[PDB]
């Protein structure tokens, strides 16, 4: 198909994320190639190279078509594409499980593989519910979180997403009614944690778990909070016997400047989800980890098992690339890489603070955010960034980047320059 | 890792489908290769080649490592592994969506890609709920199904799975309470459809959709029902203004002897899900299709959009291997192949009817089932079949197979022989 044929088919037949059919303000841009930090996109019938400043939605940490990850895929392809995980096991699952339990916060000793972040969140919720049932406390079935969060799009996942951002108006009484604390502030405020505890105390007997994104809330608004809150959450959860679940689907694998965002606080959750960067952005794969105690309590309960088992559970191909992606990350000085990346974002985004439409500029590891005073118009922003050789996709009032770890200092400055120019335009109407 | 090392890591750290940690009666068997219809498994520490009678849980329709599918993946890998589907589109998505709209039952014009069957089911449910909100009828939010079904493991999907199979007993107070009709029978009985309609009619004002597996109910018990039931459901849903959703995640792509099981009935659902065999068993991918009416109504609704968007939506690699898989199926006489396989299954399973513990033997396309009168002991059944060069995984009282379409007559004879032998041992 030609780019124009692809556009025709797409407009008629393809749903996009959170999109309409037939009512799109802009056609999607055709992508024809991806290599390293660069995408080849079609603009006015001509191919252009632009930087993937979004890491293709947080996924492409090593960039596209990395030889180590390509080779990992083709090597696994040559022996075994997939077998069912019911009754069989294999080397890719075992290797990845071994790696994951070694590098995640201490105590996370078992691994349940699934195909997407949303599913891994539901698995985590199931683990928590079956846990309490194994303890003779089936009343403990609700979840608690803070506002501003995002945990995926399946119906249990939605129930703990920010109610305003996810227009929960659309749903309910179909959505489960969960417990929400106020938005967690950026700066540490002991009063917030005290009120969180007081709220939790009122519901402790009906709560299976607190579920939060640690340090960075992604799709809910690219907000950062002080890691000390996570220490408070751990303590509250321990004292009130509520499980603590960290959703690290966006934050995992070095993105915030630590291997996992929990590491900024030295905190171990009872249950943890990982996903987006797990395969280096090649294939869908997620994992839910839990402690030995959680696993043994579920296993000793009425069901005798965790009642979940996706078709492609522990897919050999996905597990193989993920093994290579994690090993590639661990085999280099990733911490220095991310620190340098953050310094580049900070230096490059500084001039945005003085722009009329800009409310905040914030950086946390390989995450750079310009917060504007109005919703960013994509019909203006997207082509403006493409004119500057960068793929940017703002959402709501945010012009942001989560660049691949392989971006050079020059590439980071090109990315931040484009973000600055988009923000300048936002203040021009 | 060596097989011995794999087993050790596995026992300590790996969950399996619906399994325990530390309480497994039998270790899982180490798989080390898969080629064509055969798996290489480790038995007594030695690699042995056995037939994948289960198609690796319905997925491996063209067998493992099919040169055309390996090549499709390898070719895409050199071009573009993945890009975000927010604000971008690409050739593998467009090619696959065109194929899928062309070959599915008439009227399914739009395609929402996701990464698994359970997600595609929740997407279908979301489409139904947003559709009726768009029509100014927000009370229409419940689902109706018949018993015996399986639709996946996410919490909404669980709410329409069979209450007994799904151990809803362990879920008291957490699942949505849905509307269940009695088990749909094998043989066509107009009284069943009339009762179904009467039950639906009294709930019509609160029902968004009927959701069923068409013709074959898989993980809920490998039960077949007369296609005419689906004709009746289409009629009932039309007349009572309730959307009809077929979950073809197990039945799709030729498995029941029609390209999609809805084709047996000559009926089109408003929303359809596909998944397991979509990529030919290479990679996780699923799709939810809906009519233009559903799509336009959602898009004119209050959200102005379907409120869903998975990270890996329309992944180029998965879409590329799916295109090759679907084209491979469509470019051969698949209909004859499935007919031959069904004949092979019928002939090979016939002697099992006489066996003392066997209550039923049934075949539908490339699906063969021996139903026994008691639970099949996996500790006995599985090494028994392995002894005979076949990988089989019974569940409950069922010894069954969904072999790859590439299985030769000799291979079907071998699978069926092993199945008969497992059923014999059950009677002991
Ligand atoms: C909810 C219905 N049940 C009964 C508890 C199911 C459903 C599906 C499976 C799938 C199983 C399985 O074999 C596989 C799941 C995914 C790849 S193979 C399994 O062992 O137990 C199940 C049990
Ligand atoms: C439920 C929160 N919302 C609604 C405001 C979200 C959440 C996530 C996305 C992701 C989007 C997206 O760009 C992508 C989704 C998957 C790959 S890219 C998007 O366009 O809109 C969203 C909207
Ligand atoms: C993206 C994301 C999810 C959902 O992952 P999918 O693969 O899109 O289903 C869940 N939680 C967090 C924190 C995320 O960033
Ligand atoms: C397997 C199956 C599902 C769920 O698919 P996963 O990919 O395992 O989540 C849904 N519906 C039917 C009919 C199935 O057979
Ligand atoms: Cl019809």
Swiss-Prot record, chain B:
The keyword S-adenosyl-L-methionine applies. Its cofactor is pyridoxal 5'-phosphate. Pyridoxal 5'-phosphate binds at residues 117-118, 247, 310-311. Homodimer. Belongs to the class-III pyridoxal-phosphate-dependent aminotransferase family. BioA subfamily. The keyword Zinc-finger does not apply. GO terms for molecular function: adenosylmethionine-8-amino-7-oxononanoate transaminase activity; pyridoxal phosphate binding. InterPro entries: Aminotrans_3, Aminotrans_3_PPA_site, BioA, PyrdxlP-dep_Trfase, PyrdxlP-dep_Trfase_major, PyrdxlP-dep_Trfase_small. Its EC number is 2.6.1.62. It catalyses: (8S)-8-amino-7-oxononanoate + S-adenosyl-L-methionine = S-adenosyl-4-methylsulfanyl-2-oxobutanoate + (7R,8S)-7,8-diammoniononanoate. This is Adenosylmethionine-8-amino-7-oxononanoate aminotransferase. Keywords: Aminotransferase, Biotin biosynthesis, Cytoplasm, Pyridoxal phosphate, S-adenosyl-L-methionine, Transferase. The lineage of its organism: Bacteria, Bacillati, Actinomycetota, Actinomycetes, Mycobacteriales. The modification N6-(pyridoxal phosphate)lysine is found at residue 276. Catalyzes the transfer of the alpha-amino group from S-adenosyl-L-methionine (SAM) to 7-keto-8-aminopelargonic acid (KAPA) to form 7,8-diaminopelargonic acid (DAPA). It is the only aminotransferase known to utilize SAM as an amino donor. Signal peptide: none annotated. It comes from the Bacteria. GO terms for cellular component: cytoplasm. One of its GO terms (biological process) is biotin biosynthetic process. The record marks 18 as: Participates in the substrate recognition with KAPA and in a stacking interaction with the adenine ring of SAM. Substrate binds at residues 57, 150, 276, 309, 393. Pathway: Cofactor biosynthesis; biotin biosynthesis; 7,8-diaminononanoate from 8-amino-7-oxononanoate (SAM route): step 1/1. It is found in: Cytoplasm. PROSITE patterns: AA_TRANSFER_CLASS_3.
